[PDB]
Design a protein around this ligand. Structure first.
Ligand SMILES: CC(C)C[C@@H](C=O)NC(=O)[C@H](CC(C)C)NC(=O)[C@H](CC(C)C)NC(=O)OCc1ccccc1
Ligand SMILES: CC(C)C[C@@H](C=O)NC(=O)[C@H](CC(C)C)NC(=O)[C@H](CC(C)C)NC(=O)OCc1ccccc1
Ligand SMILES: CC(C)C[C@@H](C=O)NC(=O)[C@H](CC(C)C)NC(=O)[C@H](CC(C)C)NC(=O)OCc1ccccc1
Ligand SMILES: CC(C)C[C@@H](C=O)NC(=O)[C@H](CC(C)C)NC(=O)[C@H](CC(C)C)NC(=O)OCc1ccccc1
Lengths: 213, 221, 203, 196, 201, 216, 204, 202, 197
């Protein structure tokens, strides 16, 4: 009769560095074989030091983001402090699990600076399980995006390679290049890439353009 | 897949996108969906790709044998009757949606053939996932007896609407212009979208990959 | 799809709409549902487009061989009987409903309706397809015996117009053909020509 | 799958249970005890669906132990069986139904030895001997052929061994060791496990 | 997922693989499948990652409230029963969790297996997960109560490695924890790739 | 509404400098049958915003009753505050998602167009609760047919005049009439500008059937 | 899916005058690895090779059936098959079973017999033939391979560079697939010689 | 079942067939599908008999209390609005399509059609039920604005008669009611009285 | 449920099979032999659906025997394995498909010892050691841990006993007696049955 879920597409990537956290997403919202809009960013700025990326059913994403924003205000009033990136991750795991019987269809990657100031990337399954990872990719193109990050940021399967700490310039170049490659082979990924960089000074958003085909 | 065709004053213009998709992944970025049925007749193919290639190739071979026997240029109706009759017996199991356009002694003719074997002869036809998007361009801007250049522009716009507004269609626009005196197969007629430059070059160096065993067998030339 | 045939003295008038739809999308807005099986015999096609076109082509070939062999103009009943035989034999396989109307020297204008299931009936007026249900009352009340060729042409157009307005599947242009000893005259009615009935006006 | 057997003699009730707890293809434990000591003279043997057996049997055990604390006297084996049947029957039409097949063995000073058979459908029957599990089909006949109302406790152990020996030879499943206990006027007495 | 635990003379050894897989995609190779409920108690996670994580974290919260309320640490038997009771309430609702609660308590070294189905059992040796069958054989062939600590550590590493080689859903690194009377100690985290070279060499 | 009954077809929205225009056909169909042909699928929520819905008409009538009541209540307060087009859009997304979560969806797809604070707003709300804002929007078959035409013109000229937007809507409405089975010739165009919301009806589209003679 | 039951990954890349084909070596009934020495790449014409991924039975049957046809063709024609012709022959074999297909997706890497021009091609289960100027990937880890190849591939790569690029893409992509892996075998096809190398891969 | 209501200047004309059928068995061949919600407001009922009877009984009780409290004749729109609320609230639980036709002093004779699903629309003429599909073309072609009550009675009778012949579910006597300020007059047309259209021959 | 295992060493192939035949909950026979001798140096061990196992193995056995009579020389183990794979795969899409899991063991004088694993779907893999049935999941890990390519025949029996001992300890099903045979240059040799009771 009626199906409660739809796949709106989209891919989200988060990369963590010693002084920076990069959360990036495509701007294409799609239903079936059609594009609803080419300007929907899937990256949302939860706090000064944190950004969340959401991909999956759009209705769940909008509901989850509004609930997370509301919960952040409630915590700030009670604890008189902003929620930390790790605390946001633990709260999100509980909220996602609360709907275990009727799951929120969203893949969430939380990227932000930690209390020490190092970049933290936390990746969540739809039901709620989360793990801290140096780099993670989510959404329709997660399968295409991740192996390149493992090879380049990870230096996996590479011998006689100097391991050099990731730099913002290299990380930006990698985020843009993996997304152009995904646009070539993913129908739901394309139009534009929004890159939000979390640094001690603040969060800065940059937009690059992917294929409109 | 967006495949479309129009009949201009002196002939037929047939257009198609070059994107073949397996699941949601793009399998091919340069697929020729316009096939040769005969020197004067060409068919645009949408639906299961293997079914479309085989259906056009069998009909093209049958027309070639028929043309050698007749000693005359093939007529488009013969291709439509052969294509419709073959598709009907398969009962829609062979999923080939085909736009067949050609110019014969009788004149310029365009037909749309469906997998169940239904055929419609029309001035302009669109087939595939982006067919509705292409039809909207054709309804909005189609005039009978259009000139060849105007026809090429309109069919390209219809194919482009499918590429941009349909996830299934994409990559490039290929146009075949068929007229009594001239046939032009233009591939790619236009390249609407291209991949961005690679900002950082991985350039994996020699010795990066560890090899457990190596065997070199010389081949004499 | 609305298809209608009305018999007049010495002739038959055949009418149909022009819409072919896959779901709620119109693939063809100008489809011809009247097919010439022979010189003075035509069929209106309803149901699957592929099934109707295939059956019509087979009957045209069979009736053509039959006429050449007998060296005589074909009979409308013979054309209807060939359609009934194919339709009944493959009734499960084919979703096709056809109305066969034509002129024979022996029986003049005859309209035969072969509904799905391959049954053949000769009727003074025959209507078929999705829109037929909406016009059943209009056809019964309006039809008057002794209608002239012009009166039958008006009757068929007015009925098809009503069905096309109330039916999603029926639509586009009204195609009309009149068959008599002289020959077949075909007309297309579109836009202003299509009969217009006032809509209710209570905002 | 899991095997339970009981033989009620003139002055005693002899009960044996397979000691294997198993996952889908592998035996997780070979020392499992499927017998729950409800009271000094009452043993409940429970087999059935995973989880349901431990939860239901423990609930009955706690209630019987509560009756002793509250009244200072133990429930009769007949009363304990009836309390179990009522609880299982109430759960049958409830949202939570326990799939448990049980044997209750007990000694009452007034009524002597009693053995009760209850299926998952909570039908209670007093029996001279009864068994549960797929092996029960193979062993019920051996008990039927050699059981006598006046059978001695030593002969009953021999008869039980014959049924266990039959399971090893014909049963498809591996049930290497069995837990043997005897209930008497003196009380429940553990007996050496029969092992193969 | 392969997780194994055995009780020997010098304590309880808990071992685990590090692979989390969505379908045939290997989402993670660094997952920690052993949760530290308290300085003397550990919990093993197998089955759905979220189900085990939420329920074991809930058990950890209950265990801390027990310690604060009663001023004494929870027993391994009590913690195992508490997890069994909570999962049982949701029985038949699709939770998939296979866990081994391993700890040292007043009674001594303790190992219990708790399942979403509701099985709670105590044994010297237990293995849980997709690769449990492969781990069980290597562990059973080389397991002895009198094994020395170094010999015990090797058995746990070998059993996880052989299980990873055969099982697609098992892989990553062997996380080793040893429960001792003083408390649990993390022992070693070894990539199966590094282990493969040592064992094959 | 597990099963829809009388339903409406595509609703088209285009944003122009100084306002938004939404167009809808005036027919509600029970399956194939064109049961009610004079119904209005466009509603004026307030001077700032207007709403158009495609899907079960009964659900739309309930939502119009709830939305109309809310506007009447705020007007009574006289606070000087008003519901902005975005606020009405956010309320609709919350309402649609809540009904979907209860597995009792309102079977409607709605376009919200409003002009407030000198900025034009066009929004889309689905039965599932999917919601977004765009320069041009279309529902049902409009997304497949009209949206490609609207998007192409918008890319060539990002900012459109009111006359250009009115022409684009009429051309797209003609395409739907030609290729949508459930479409109807009579249609209404609603415009929201600084002055207010004006609904114009019943407009009709001239159609060309010349291709009928062309086929041979 | 039926394809995921036995698993498998095959890919081919094109170089300046060389082609390379690589495959995972794991044979598994489902989650269990029966063997790590399975062959998915079969020699067809000395400088022409076909890699087949899918049901292991179908991979073996199509290789055996294709060799029967190719061996007969070479004997009657008197010439080694051209790489394009092999694609046409395999497509005909797959289409013959269109209604009940062999669950194998073939990738062909070869050098033209006379010109020595590089050729790479991929086919679907029902015989659709796709020819590419860069790389063709088939298997359980196809999306992962496409991502690695699109970023790593560069035009006019020398044979040593082609080997490094195909290896890095295959190793990292099989790393992200549970049912593919247990070693990778890479063949570099050059007119002068064939170099076959087995890479060091994680066994898990 | 065929139910038809037409609005003339100064009032409304209501009509219905008399057949209630369980399967192919006509359980009641003389049923009254036209029922009085109030003195000048009536409802034509189509769909499940139990649902139509229950909703009609409830709305009559609801409308009567409202009229007594207001000390005013009830508005036809209010009866339709009360019917619409019941049908929309229980659209999943009910299979009833109804037409409300009545005369009120403020707006005169009015016909409101509440189709299944709880939609409410005001129509100059309304036709409902399975028999309605057959007469849709006739009602559109025959209807003329400015029809008198006598013409409206004939129009309703002719349309119902055509539907009854085509529909197996429809049939039996034709029940016609005319509502105006003066009052409600109900006539039943049976046998020869029912309008007859010649059958086709040869 | 039925168990087959093959261990291959430098000059020999050691094969063992469960000796139990069972219907429903009862083991009807404890002396069943699942090993069919295709030729003097070839054994095919078959486990699978009832009837299909005997029909397929007997047909393969008789065809292999016909080759010796018609040509005067027996087939190689590799040729026999390829002949079984072709026949099973041909029957897979046929109306009657055989649900048979087969292990083929043989010694060829020219190419030495061979062990072949074939699934019901008909995939043939040459393996150093292989097992079939649910028992394989527990047994294969022991073999991977203790198998060395240069293992002696006496050590191979020690490995086989360890694998079967684990089955007694962990397998839910009762498989008390296992038939053991070896193939070498001399030929097939029966070895004493391993009975745990
Ligand atoms: C125009 C054709 C050349 C292909 C075109 C369709 O219009 N685009 C496509 O994406 C086709 C058609 C499909 C959507 C029905 N989709 C596909 O998935 C492929 C195309 C690759 C082999 C290159 N066609 C195909 O037959 O492979 C998948 C498949 C396998 C078995 C049965 C049916 C379909
Ligand atoms: C003269 C008429 C018989 C032609 C016309 C009028 O009825 N045909 C129709 O209206 C019928 C509607 C009916 C099937 C409910 N439509 C048709 O017969 C077919 C629809 C297909 C889904 C089989 N029309 C059509 O254009 O088919 C295109 C097609 C064919 C196969 C797959 C997908 C799409
Ligand atoms: C943390 C441990 C308890 C996880 C451990 C236990 O088995 N290892 C595992 O492999 C488990 C078992 C699962 C395949 C049934 N894997 C998992 O739980 C993985 C979690 C990843 C997506 C992050 N699968 C899962 O939870 O599904 C969530 C999901 C839902 C829809 C789409 C994609 C992913
Ligand atoms: C008074 C009229 C509103 C009744 C008229 C309307 O069409 N006929 C009906 O309502 C139905 C048929 C209808 C469901 C298509 N006809 C009937 O004869 C009966 C009522 C008799 C049992 C007393 N309705 C009926 O279907 O049986 C009762 C029922 C009701 C709902 C579901 C299943 C069974």
């Amino acid at each position: 009769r009626f199906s409660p879920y739809v796949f709106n597409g989209g891919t989200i990537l988060a990369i963590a560095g010693e002084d920076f956290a990069i959360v990036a997403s495509d701007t294409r919202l799609s239903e079936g074989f059609s594009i609803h809009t080419r300007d929907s960013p899937k990256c949302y700025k939860l706090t000064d030091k944190t950004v969340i990326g959401c991909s999956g059913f759009h209705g769940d994403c909008l509901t989850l983001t509004k609930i997370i924003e509301a919960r952040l205000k409630m915590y700030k009033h009670s604890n008189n402090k902003a929620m930390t990136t790790g605390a946001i991750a633990a709260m999100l795991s509980t909220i996602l699990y609360s709907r275990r019987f009727f799951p929120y269809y969203v893949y969430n990657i939380i990227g932000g600076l930690d209390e020490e100031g190092k970049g933290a990337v936390y990746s969540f399954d739809p039901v709620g399980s989360y793990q801290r990872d140096s780099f993670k990719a989510g959404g329709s193109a997660s399968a295409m995006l991740q192996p390149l990050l493992d090879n380049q940021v990870g230096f996996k399967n590479m011998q006689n390679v100097e391991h050099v700490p990731l730099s913002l310039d290299r990380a930006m170049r990698l985020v843009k290049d993996v997304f152009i490659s995904a646009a070539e082979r993913d129908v739901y990924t394309g139009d534009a890439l929004r890159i939000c960089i979390v640094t001690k000074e603040g969060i800065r958003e940059e937009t690059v353009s992917l294929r409109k085909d | 897949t967006t495949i479309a065709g129009v009949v201009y004053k002196d002939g037929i213009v047939l257009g198609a996108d070059t994107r073949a998709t397996e699941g949601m992944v793009v399998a091919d970025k340069n697929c020729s969906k316009i096939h040769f049925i005969s020197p004067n007749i060409y068919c645009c193919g949408a639906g299961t790709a293997a079914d479309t290639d085989m259906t056009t190739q069998l009909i093209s071979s049958n027309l070639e044998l028929h043309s050698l026997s007749t000693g005359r240029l093939p007529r488009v109706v013969t291709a439509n009757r052969m294509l419709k009759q073959m598709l009907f017996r398969y009962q829609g199991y062979i999923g080939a949606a085909l736009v067949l356009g050609g110019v014969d002694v009788t004149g310029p003719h365009l037909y749309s053939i469906y997998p169940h074997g239904s055929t419609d002869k029309l001035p302009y036809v669109t087939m595939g996932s982006g067919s509705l998007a292409a039809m909207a361009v054709f309804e909005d801007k189609f005039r009978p007896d259009m000139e060849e250049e105007e026809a090429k522009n309109l069919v390209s716009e219809a194919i482009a609407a499918g590429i941009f507004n349909d996830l299934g269609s994409g990559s490039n626009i290929d146009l075949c212009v068929i007229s009594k005196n001239k046939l032009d197969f233009l591939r790619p007629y236009t390249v609407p979208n291209k991949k961005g430059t690679r900002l950082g070059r991985y350039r994996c160096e020699k010795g990066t990959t560890a090899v457990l065993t190596e065997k070199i067998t010389p081949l004499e030339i | 799809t609305t298809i209608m045939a009305v018999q007049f003295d010495g002739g038959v008038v055949l009418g149909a709409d022009s819409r072919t739809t896959t779901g709620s999308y119109i693939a063809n807005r100008v489809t011809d549902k009247l097919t010439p099986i022979h010189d003075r015999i035509f069929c209106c096609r309803s149901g699957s487009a592929a099934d109707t076109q295939a059956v019509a082509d087979a009957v045209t070939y069979q009736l053509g061989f039959h006429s050449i062999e007998l060296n005589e103009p074909p009979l409308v009943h013979t054309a209807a009987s060939l359609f009934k035989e194919m339709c009944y034999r493959y009734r499960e396989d084919l979703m096709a409903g056809i109305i066969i109307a034509g002129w024979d020297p022996q029986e003049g204008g005859q309209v035969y309706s072969v509904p799905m299931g391959g049954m053949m009936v000769r009727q003074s007026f025959a209507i078929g397809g999705s829109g037929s249900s909406y016009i059943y009352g209009y056809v019964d009340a309006t039809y008057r015996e002794g209608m002239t060729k012009e009166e039958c042409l008006q009757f068929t157009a007015n009925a098809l117009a009503l069905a096309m307005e109330r039916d999603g599947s029926s639509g586009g242009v009204i195609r009309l053909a009149a068959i008599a000893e002289s020959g077949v005259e075909r007309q297309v009615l579109l836009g202003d020509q299509i009969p217009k009935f006032a809509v209710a006006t209570l905002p | 799958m899991e095997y339970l057997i009981g033989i009620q003699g003139p002055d005693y009730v002899l009960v044996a249970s397979d000691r294997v707890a198993a996952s889908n293809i592998v035996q997780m434990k070979d020392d499992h005890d499927k017998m729950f000591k409800m009271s000094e003279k009452i043993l409940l043997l429970c087999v059935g669906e995973a989880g349901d057996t431990v939860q239901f049997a423990e609930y009955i055990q706690k209630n019987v132990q509560l009756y002793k604390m509250r009244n200072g006297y133990e429930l009769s084996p007949t009363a304990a069986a009836n309390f179990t049947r009522r609880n299982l029957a109430d759960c049958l039409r409830s949202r939570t139904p326990y799939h448990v097949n049980l044997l209750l063995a007990g000694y009452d000073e007034h009524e002597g030895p009693a053995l009760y058979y209850m299926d998952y459908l909570a039908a209670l029957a007093k029996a001279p001997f009864a068994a549960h599990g797929y092996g029960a089909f193979l062993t019920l006949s051996i008990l039927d052929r050699y059981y006598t109302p006046t059978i001695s406790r030593e002969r009953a152990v021999e008869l039980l061994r014959k049924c266990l020996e039959e399971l090893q030879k014909r049963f498809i499943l591996n049930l290497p060791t069995f837990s043997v206990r005897i209930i008497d006027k003196n009380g429940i007495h553990d007996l050496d496990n029969i092992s193969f | 997922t392969t997780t194994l635990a055995f009780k020997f003379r010098h304590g309880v050894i808990v071992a685990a693989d590090s692979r989390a897989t969505a379908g045939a995609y290997i989402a993670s190779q660094t997952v920690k499948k052993v949760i530290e409920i308290n300085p003397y108690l550990l919990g093993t996670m197998a089955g759905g990652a979220a189900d085990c994580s939420f329920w074991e974290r809930l058990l950890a919260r209950q265990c801390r409230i027990y310690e604060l309320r009663n001023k004494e640490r929870i027993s391994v038997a009590a913690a195992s029963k508490l997890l069994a009771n909570m999962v049982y309430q949701y029985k038949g609702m699709g939770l998939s969790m296979g866990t081994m609660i391993c700890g040292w308590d007043k009674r001594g070294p303790g190992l219990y297996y708790v399942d979403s189905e509701g099985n709670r059992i105590s044994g010297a040796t237990f293995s849980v997960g997709s690769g449990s069958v492969y781990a069980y054989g290597v562990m059973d062939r080389g397991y002895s109560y009198d094994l020395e600590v170094e010999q015990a550590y090797d058995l746990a590493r070998r059993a996880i490695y052989q299980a990873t080689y055969r099982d697609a859903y098992s892989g990553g690194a062997v996380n080793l924890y040893h429960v001792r009377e003083d408390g649990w100690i993390r022992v070693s985290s070894d990539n199966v790739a590094d282990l493969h070279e040592k064992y094959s060499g | 509404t597990q099963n829809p009954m009388v339903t409406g077809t595509s609703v088209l929205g285009v944003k122009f400098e100084g306002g938004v225009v939404i167009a809808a056909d005036m027919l509600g169909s029970y399956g194939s049958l064109a049961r009610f042909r004079n119904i209005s699928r466009i509603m004026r929520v307030n001077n700032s915003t207007m709403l158009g819905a495609s899907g079960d008409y009964a659900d739309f009538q309930y939502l119009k009753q709830v939305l109309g009541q809310m506007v009447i209540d705020e007007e009574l307060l006289g606070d000087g505050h008003s519901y902005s087009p975005r606020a009405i859009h956010s309320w609709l997304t919350r309402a649609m998602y809540s009904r979907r979560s209860k597995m009792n969806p309102l079977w409607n797809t709605m376009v919200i167009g409003g002009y407030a604070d000198g900025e034009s707003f066009l929004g889309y709300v689905d039965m599932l609760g999917v919601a977004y804002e765009a320069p041009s929007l279309a529902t049902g078959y409009g997304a497949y047919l009209a949206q490609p035409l609207l998007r192409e013109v918008l890319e060539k000229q990002p900012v459109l005049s009111q006359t250009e937007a009115r022409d684009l809507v009429e051309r797209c409405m003609r395409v739907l009439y030609y290729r949508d089975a459930r479409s109807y010739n009579r249609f209404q165009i609603a415009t929201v500008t600084e002055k207010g919301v004006e609904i114009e009806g019943p407009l009709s589209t001239e159609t060309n059937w010349d291709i009928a003679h062309m086929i041979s | 899916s039926i394809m995921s039951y036995n698993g498998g990954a095959v890919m081919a890349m094109k170089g300046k005058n060389c082609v390379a084909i690589a495959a995972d070596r794991r044979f598994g009934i489902q989650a269990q690895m029966v063997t790590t020495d399975f062959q998915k790449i079969f020699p067809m014409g000395d400088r022409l090779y076909i890699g087949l991924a899918g049901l292991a039975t179908d991979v073996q049957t199509v290789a055996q059936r294709l060799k029967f046809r190719l061996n007969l063709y070479e004997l009657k024609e008197g010439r080694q098959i051209k790489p394009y012709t092999l694609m046409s022959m395999v497509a005909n074999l797959l289409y013959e079973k269109r209604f009940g297909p062999y669950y194998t997706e073939p990738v062909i890497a070869g050098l033209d017999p006379k010109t020595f021009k590089p050729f790479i091609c991929s086919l679907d289960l029902i015989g659709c033939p796709m020819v590419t100027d860069d790389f063709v990937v088939s298997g359980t880890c196809a999306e992962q391979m496409y991502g690695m190849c699109e970023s790593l591939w560069e035009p006019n790569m020398d044979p040593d560079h082609l080997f490094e690029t195909i290896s890095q893409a295959m190793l990292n992509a099989v790393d992200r697939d549970a049912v593919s892996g247990m070693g990778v075998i890479v063949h570099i096809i050059e007119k002068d010689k064939i170099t076959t190398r087995t890479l060091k891969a994680r066994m898990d």
